[PDB]
mmCIF file of C-alpha atoms and ligand atoms in Angstrom:
data_model
loop_
_atom_site.group_PDB
_atom_site.id
_atom_site.type_symbol
_atom_site.label_atom_id
_atom_site.label_comp_id
_atom_site.label_asym_id
_atom_site.label_seq_id
_atom_site.Cartn_x
_atom_site.Cartn_y
_atom_site.Cartn_z
ATOM 1 C CA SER A 1 -0.077 0.004 -0.343
ATOM 2 C CA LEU A 2 1.412 3.747 -0.851
ATOM 3 C CA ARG A 3 -1.694 6.751 -0.528
ATOM 4 C CA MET A 4 -0.301 9.778 -2.163
ATOM 5 C CA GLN A 5 -0.805 13.069 -2.946
ATOM 6 C CA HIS A 6 -0.152 14.717 -6.720
ATOM 7 C CA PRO A 7 -0.595 18.135 -7.851
ATOM 8 C CA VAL A 8 -2.533 19.138 -10.556
ATOM 9 C CA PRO A 9 -2.095 22.692 -12.930
ATOM 10 C CA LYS A 10 -5.394 25.340 -12.964
ATOM 11 C CA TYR A 11 -4.560 29.336 -13.293
ATOM 12 C CA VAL A 12 -7.305 32.115 -12.461
ATOM 13 C CA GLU A 13 -7.911 35.254 -15.902
ATOM 14 C CA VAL A 14 -6.570 39.265 -13.995
ATOM 15 C CA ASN A 15 -6.724 41.802 -15.805
ATOM 16 C CA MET A 16 -4.836 44.946 -15.416
ATOM 17 C CA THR A 17 -5.317 48.792 -16.876
ATOM 18 C CA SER A 18 -3.510 52.194 -15.623
ATOM 19 C CA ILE A 19 -4.677 55.000 -14.612
ATOM 20 C CA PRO A 20 -3.426 57.927 -16.810
ATOM 21 C CA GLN A 21 -2.089 60.855 -14.004
ATOM 22 C CA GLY A 22 -2.924 58.342 -11.551
ATOM 23 C CA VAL A 23 -6.405 60.038 -12.094
ATOM 24 C CA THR B 1 -56.127 94.653 5.796
ATOM 25 C CA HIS B 2 -60.733 94.120 6.085
ATOM 26 C CA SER B 3 -62.466 91.004 8.927
ATOM 27 C CA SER B 4 -66.212 91.452 9.146
ATOM 28 C CA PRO B 5 -67.355 88.773 10.291
ATOM 29 C CA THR B 6 -68.845 87.225 6.337
ATOM 30 C CA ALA B 7 -65.818 89.334 4.891
ATOM 31 C CA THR B 8 -62.375 89.048 4.975
ATOM 32 C CA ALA B 9 -59.342 90.580 2.525
ATOM 33 C CA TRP B 10 -55.345 90.210 2.750
ATOM 34 C CA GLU B 11 -52.309 91.763 1.391
ATOM 35 C CA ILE B 12 -49.188 89.823 0.966
ATOM 36 C CA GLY B 13 -45.398 90.656 0.123
ATOM 37 C CA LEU B 14 -43.407 88.387 -2.382
ATOM 38 C CA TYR B 15 -39.967 88.581 -3.110
ATOM 39 C CA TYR B 16 -38.316 85.992 -5.693
ATOM 40 C CA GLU B 17 -35.576 86.270 -7.119
ATOM 41 C CA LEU B 18 -33.939 84.530 -10.709
ATOM 42 C CA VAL B 19 -30.670 83.338 -11.155
ATOM 43 C CA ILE B 20 -30.370 83.974 -14.922
ATOM 44 C CA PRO B 21 -27.734 81.563 -16.380
ATOM 45 C CA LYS B 22 -25.048 82.087 -18.534
ATOM 46 C CA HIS B 23 -24.168 78.346 -19.659
ATOM 47 C CA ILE B 24 -25.533 74.520 -18.228
ATOM 48 C CA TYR B 25 -23.217 71.322 -18.225
ATOM 49 C CA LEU B 26 -25.043 68.418 -18.030
ATOM 50 C CA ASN B 27 -22.525 65.479 -18.805
ATOM 51 C CA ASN B 28 -20.048 65.572 -15.509
ATOM 52 C CA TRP B 29 -17.406 63.410 -14.024
ATOM 53 C CA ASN B 30 -15.836 64.327 -10.261
ATOM 54 C CA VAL B 31 -12.155 64.142 -10.231
ATOM 55 C CA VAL B 32 -10.146 61.399 -8.038
ATOM 56 C CA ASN B 33 -6.848 61.806 -7.175
ATOM 57 C CA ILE B 34 -4.903 57.832 -6.512
ATOM 58 C CA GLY B 35 -1.346 59.138 -7.181
ATOM 59 C CA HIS B 36 1.827 56.281 -6.720
ATOM 60 C CA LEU B 37 4.354 54.926 -4.014
ATOM 61 C CA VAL B 38 7.909 55.589 -4.999
ATOM 62 C CA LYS B 39 11.272 53.637 -2.787
ATOM 63 C CA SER B 40 13.693 56.034 -2.227
ATOM 64 C CA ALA B 41 17.002 56.214 -0.091
ATOM 65 C CA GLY B 42 14.940 53.178 2.979
ATOM 66 C CA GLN B 43 11.681 55.407 3.050
ATOM 67 C CA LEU B 44 8.323 54.688 1.207
ATOM 68 C CA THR B 45 6.450 57.689 0.026
ATOM 69 C CA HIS B 46 3.143 58.650 -1.853
ATOM 70 C CA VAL B 47 3.290 60.800 -4.331
ATOM 71 C CA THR B 48 -0.039 63.343 -6.141
ATOM 72 C CA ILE B 49 -0.294 65.810 -8.644
HETATM 73 C C1 LIG C 1 -10.850 31.941 -16.121
HETATM 74 O O1 LIG C 1 -9.157 31.664 -16.412
HETATM 75 C C2 LIG C 1 -8.026 30.946 -16.975
HETATM 76 C C3 LIG C 1 -7.523 31.503 -17.339
HETATM 77 O O2 LIG C 1 -6.379 30.514 -17.834
HETATM 78 C C4 LIG C 1 -9.449 30.201 -17.924
HETATM 79 O O3 LIG C 1 -8.227 28.020 -17.755
HETATM 80 C C5 LIG C 1 -8.576 27.892 -19.713
HETATM 81 O O4 LIG C 1 -9.492 26.781 -18.201
HETATM 82 C C6 LIG C 1 -10.025 26.270 -20.201
HETATM 83 C C7 LIG C 1 -11.016 24.706 -19.699
HETATM 84 O O5 LIG C 1 -12.686 26.043 -19.592
HETATM 85 C C8 LIG C 1 -8.807 24.923 -20.456
HETATM 86 O O6 LIG C 1 -9.209 24.671 -21.234
HETATM 87 C C9 LIG C 1 -7.796 26.416 -20.969
HETATM 88 O O7 LIG C 1 -6.583 25.191 -20.821
HETATM 89 C C10 LIG C 1 -7.242 26.922 -20.248
HETATM 90 N N1 LIG C 1 -5.765 27.753 -20.541
HETATM 91 C C11 LIG C 1 -6.478 29.501 -20.073
HETATM 92 C C12 LIG C 1 -4.906 30.073 -19.939
HETATM 93 O O8 LIG C 1 -6.961 29.966 -21.035
HETATM 94 C C13 LIG C 1 -10.186 29.528 -16.767
HETATM 95 O O9 LIG C 1 -10.842 27.506 -17.462
HETATM 96 C C14 LIG C 1 -11.579 30.765 -16.434
HETATM 97 N N2 LIG C 1 -12.982 30.709 -15.826
HETATM 98 C C15 LIG C 1 -13.086 31.347 -15.951
HETATM 99 C C16 LIG C 1 -14.331 30.707 -15.352
HETATM 100 O O10 LIG C 1 -14.125 32.019 -16.882
#
């Protein structure tokens, strides 16, 4: 017997936009 | 001005102020000033215009 936990890949999408002059 | 059991009269003095517009603006936004952070010779600084 041997029981194991294999990591598996996944992602979330993040979008970013700028703020000219910080305004 | 007059008072009888069957008849009255009254007077009222009304003053009005009318603003006359020069221009009218409808589609408007408030400003909000977020600035930027800067790290300089060890000190964290918030910078604004
Ligand atoms: C949110 O974004 C990620 C971005 O990585 C999406 O991942 C995709 O998912 C599908 C399954 O529907 C896979 O076939 C793709 O290979 C994945 N890759 C990418 C880079 O998109 C995730 O599924 C999205 N989920 C939602 C709720 O929008």
